[PDB]
Design an enzyme around this catalytic site. Structure first.
Site, PDB file in Angstrom:
ATOM      1  N   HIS A   1      37.443  39.743  26.269  1.00 28.16           N
ATOM      2  CA  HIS A   1      36.034  39.853  26.615  1.00 28.16           C
ATOM      3  C   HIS A   1      35.879  40.428  28.015  1.00 28.16           C
ATOM      4  CE1 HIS A   1      37.230  36.033  28.406  1.00 28.16           C
ATOM      5  NE2 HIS A   1      36.236  36.207  29.257  1.00 28.16           N
TER       6      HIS A   1
ATOM      7  N   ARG B   1      22.489  36.404  38.788  1.00 26.78           N
ATOM      8  CA  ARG B   1      22.897  35.682  37.588  1.00 26.78           C
ATOM      9  C   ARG B   1      23.961  34.660  37.960  1.00 26.78           C
ATOM     10  NH1 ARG B   1      27.173  37.658  33.135  1.00 26.78           N
ATOM     11  NH2 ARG B   1      26.873  36.003  31.572  1.00 26.78           N
TER      12      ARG B   1
ATOM     13  N   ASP C   1      41.553  34.934  29.346  1.00 28.03           N
ATOM     14  CA  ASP C   1      41.453  33.842  30.301  1.00 28.03           C
ATOM     15  C   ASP C   1      42.748  33.044  30.331  1.00 28.03           C
ATOM     16  OD1 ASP C   1      37.986  33.227  29.467  1.00 28.03           O
ATOM     17  OD2 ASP C   1      38.864  34.458  31.061  1.00 28.03           O
TER      18      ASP C   1
ATOM     19  N   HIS D   1      39.669  41.272  29.854  1.00 27.42           N
ATOM     20  CA  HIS D   1      40.735  40.343  30.213  1.00 27.42           C
ATOM     21  C   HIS D   1      40.776  39.191  29.221  1.00 27.42           C
ATOM     22  CE1 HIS D   1      37.140  38.598  32.059  1.00 27.42           C
ATOM     23  NE2 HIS D   1      37.749  37.430  31.963  1.00 27.42           N
TER      24      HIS D   1
HETATM   25 FE   LIG Z   1      36.725  35.324  31.213  1.00 26.56          FE
END
Ligand SMILES: [Fe+2]
Ligand SMILES: [Fe+2]
Lengths: 194, 195
Positions: B177, B187, B127, B125
């Site tokens: 990314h 995490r 951002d 995707h």
């Molecule tokens: Fe992202």
């Protein structure tokens, strides 16, 4: 006889007369389309025919609606905003998805023609996700010098062919400035797309 | 005694406890700041202390407002502290990194929790931001294994980011990314979409 305004009402005739044949024939397969990465993530590619560039300049010269700042006229001031919207979302957007990892075009911010002449340029980022720059007239034959310095890339781009487009990121990663011409006139078509 | 919320009321004490010493010591001189360009136009740099990351995880774990499994900073009353952090500390560093680009506004700011039952659909995707901040909040190998991020356009795998270190990258167009799956543990990351 088809005109600039007959898109998409006369879509087939419009594409043949105004879209560059190398771009038109690669609409469904840009992997073999001959474009050039002039510097990192900045691409130059044929988009429009010389007839498109000549008639756009003619419309703008005839209207004489130039700003009294950079001398420019908005496409919507000559009634070409809807045609340009079709160009971006139907022709440019698929190529953007090919160049920039399937990035989806959202909306058009601005679209205008800039006229550089002798009677009429700081570094900056653009108010856009990506910026389109189409050369509307011929380097050397109609003007000298000119071009664009990509500050971050340390790369100066000049002498773009008629009808070829330059595409680059608006913000963050493509700091740039236009460079002045030293004689003649230079016309370009600029669009800020989000 | 100073807490995460005492910014900017107790600014000096907040900076010493929560800002990484390397970043705090280079706020007015970024050329000697030891940051790393892990791939083209993507930078990793220390930003926060282990105390900042530990306390942020405590606030998110206690609040238990997880709903990716994430929690926005305004849901725990930290959005305005984050607004001060971005504009006073991050924005000048962004001008150093990205040719004087001025930070406009903050779209989102949230903490993501990855675990075994909630790895999310790790899809590629862009951002919804001009640039994105990604801070690693807990320790690779000690509290989780594998994980990380893949920059698809850069063809670069980024794993094992240190606690309190940030990764900054373009949001749209040039930094496609995806997050990588973890193989154990949990995490935590702090993500902010900035325009
Ligand atoms: Fe992202
Ligand atoms: Fe520009």
């Amino acid at each position: 006889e088809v005109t600039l305004y007959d898109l998409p009402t006369r879509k087939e005739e419009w594409e043949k007369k105004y879209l560059h044949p190398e771009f038109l024939s690669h609409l469904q397969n840009f992997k073999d389309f001959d474009y050039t990465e002039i510097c990192n993530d900045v691409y130059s590619f044929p988009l429009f025919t010389p007839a498109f560039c000549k008639e756009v300049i003619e419309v703008m010269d005839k209207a004489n609606l130039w700003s009294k700042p950079t001398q420019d006229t908005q496409l919507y001031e000559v009634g070409l905003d809807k045609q340009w919207h079709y160009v971006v979302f139907n022709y440019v957007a698929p190529f953007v998805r090919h160049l920039y990892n399937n990035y989806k075009t959202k909306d058009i911010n601005l679209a205008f023609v800039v006229k550089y002449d002798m009677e009429r340029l700081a570094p900056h980022h653009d108010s856009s996700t990506y910026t389109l720059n189409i050369a509307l007239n011929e380097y050397g034959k109609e003007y000298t010098a000119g071009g664009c310095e990509f500050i971050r890339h340390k790369f100066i781009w000049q002498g773009q062919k008629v009808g070829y487009a330059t595409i680059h990121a608006g913000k963050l990663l493509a700091y740039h400035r236009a460079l002045p011409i030293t004689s003649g006139k230079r016309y370009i078509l600029v669009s800020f797309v989000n």
